[PDB]
DNA sequence: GTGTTTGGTGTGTTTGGGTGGTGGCCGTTTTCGTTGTTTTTTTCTGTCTCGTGCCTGGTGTCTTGGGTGTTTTCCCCTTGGCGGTTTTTTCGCGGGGGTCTGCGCGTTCGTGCGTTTTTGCGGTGTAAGTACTTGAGCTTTCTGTCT
């Protein structure tokens, strides 16, 4: 039962485009994409942590990594989204 | 332009097989209290970067000469392109065989974690003779007494 991001990418698609489906080949592309972005961000956060002699990866490390990797408006909106989500989550 | 006339998008009906939706369940996310620590916080020292100031002259830079090398034009000679025909092998489906990749079960020895030992690496705890000083001995005078 080798695990994947499929259910979520289909949930998000159904939210943004209720009448649009997804081929298996394109679904594979999305899984690869998610995995790749995950590894870019986590790796940058790891480097940041090591440089500053810290042992925990917190939201600050992730935010900075996002700012370093995502170009322009992609970064600005991603940061907004991430901040909104961690705000909503802490205040439950 | 007028004109034919090969290429390409729009239209319709038909097929199917591949995506979406649902049932079953199990394994992974969580709800909880406790531990232990990696933060964060404040307060310290005191490094290093910013700021200014003066003087020198290496460098920048404005400008005249000019010449050469880039831009365009004319001509060519040729080598890719488009087409027709023949070749052939890529590819498709089916069948057969075997290797080797993955699960599971058993373990042993290899590494992490610890107390401990240690070298490098680095901080700094004799006999003389002269000059000077000091302590013992006795003067003046002045102040009190006293006939």
UniProtKB/Swiss-Prot annotation:
* Modification N6-crotonyllysine, positions: 2
Record-listed PolyADP-ribosyl glutamic acid modification sites? 3
A single Gene Ontology CC term? CENP-A containing nucleosome
Which residues are recorded as modified (Phosphothreonine)?
83
Reported modifications of this chain = Monoubiquitination at Lys-2 (H2BK34Ub) by the MSL1/MSL2 dimer is required for histone H3 'Lys-4' (H3K4me) and 'Lys-79' (H3K79me) methylation and transcription activation at specific gene loci, such as HOXA9 and MEIS1 loci. Similarly, monoubiquitination at Lys-88 (H2BK120Ub) by the RNF20/40 complex gives a specific tag for epigenetic transcriptional activation and is also prerequisite for histone H3 'Lys-4' and 'Lys-79' methylation. It also functions cooperatively with the FACT dimer to stimulate elongation by RNA polymerase II. Phosphorylation at Ser-4 (H2BS36ph) by AMPK in response to stress promotes transcription.
Q: Which residues carry this modification: N6-acetyllysine?
A: 53
Q: Which GO terms describe its molecular function?
A: DNA binding; lipopolysaccharide binding; protein heterodimerization activity; structural constituent of chromatin
Task: List the keywords (alphabetical).
Answer: Acetylation, ADP-ribosylation, Antibiotic, Antimicrobial, Chromosome, DNA-binding, Glycoprotein, Hydroxylation, Isopeptide bond, Methylation, Nucleosome core, Nucleus, Phosphoprotein, Ubl conjugation
- In the record, N6,N6,N6-trimethyllysine modifications are located at 53
Glycosylated residues, chain numbering: 80
* N6-succinyllysine found at: 2, 84, 88
Give the N6-glutaryllysine positions (modified residues).
Answer: 2, 11, 14, 76, 84, 88
| UniProt family annotation | Belongs to the histone H2B family.
Q: How does it assemble?
A: The nucleosome is a histone octamer containing two molecules each of H2A, H2B, H3 and H4 assembled in one H3-H4 heterotetramer and two H2A-H2B heterodimers. The octamer wraps approximately 147 bp of DNA. Heterodimer H2BC11 and H2AZ1 interacts with VPS72 (via N-terminal domain).
Q: What does this protein do?
A: Core component of nucleosome. Nucleosomes wrap and compact DNA into chromatin, limiting DNA accessibility to the cellular machineries which require DNA as a template. Histones thereby play a central role in transcription regulation, DNA repair, DNA replication and chromosomal stability. DNA accessibility is regulated via a complex set of post-translational modifications of histones, also called histone code, and nucleosome remodeling. Has broad antibacterial activity. May contribute to the formation of the functional antimicrobial barrier of the colonic epithelium, and to the bactericidal activity of amniotic fluid.
Q: What is this protein called?
A: Histone H2B type 1-J
**Which organism was this protein described from?**
Homo sapiens (Human)
Give the stretch of the parent protein shown, with its full length: 34 to 125 of 126
């Amino acid at each position: 039962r080798k695990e994947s991001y499929s259910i979520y990418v289909y949930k998000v698609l159904k939210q943004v485009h209720p009448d649009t489906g997804i081929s298996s080949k394109a679904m594979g592309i999305m899984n690869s994409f998610v995995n790749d972005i995950f590894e870019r961000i986590a790796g940058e956060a790891s480097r940041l942590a090591h440089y500053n002699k810290r042992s925990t990866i917190t939201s600050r490390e992730i935010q900075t990594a996002v700012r370093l990797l995502l170009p322009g408006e992609l970064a600005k909106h991603a940061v907004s989204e991430g901040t909104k989500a961690v705000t909503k989550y802490t205040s439950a």
